[model samples]
Target: DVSPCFCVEDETSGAKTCVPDNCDASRGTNP
Candidate 1:
């Protein structure tokens, strides 16, 4: 798991979403 990760906004909802530490988007895959 990565300590630092990516947080993206939900375009339609205008909400802030972050990937779990276990699921690192920068790595391009999930555990």
Candidate 2:
């Protein structure tokens, strides 16, 4: 999974709270 890349100005604790979302980063054959 990718590391956190949130904006500091937008969210002060974004870097800590927000993180790179990769729920379906890799798609596989859905049965």
The segments of candidate 1 whose C-alpha lies over 4 angstroms from its true place after superposition are: 12-14, 21-31
Put down candidate 1 lDDT per residue, 1-31, tens digits, no spaces: 6455566676765765666532443565343
Compared with the true structure, what per-residue lDDT tens digits does model 2 show for residues 1-31? Answer: 4343432233554533322432224332121
Q: For each candidate, give its TM-score against the true structure.
A: 0.34, 0.15
Q: Which residue pairs show backbone clashes in model 1?
A: none
TM-score of model 2 relative to the true fold? 0.15
lDDT score of residue 24 within candidate 2? 28
| lDDT comparing candidate 1 with the true structure | 0.53
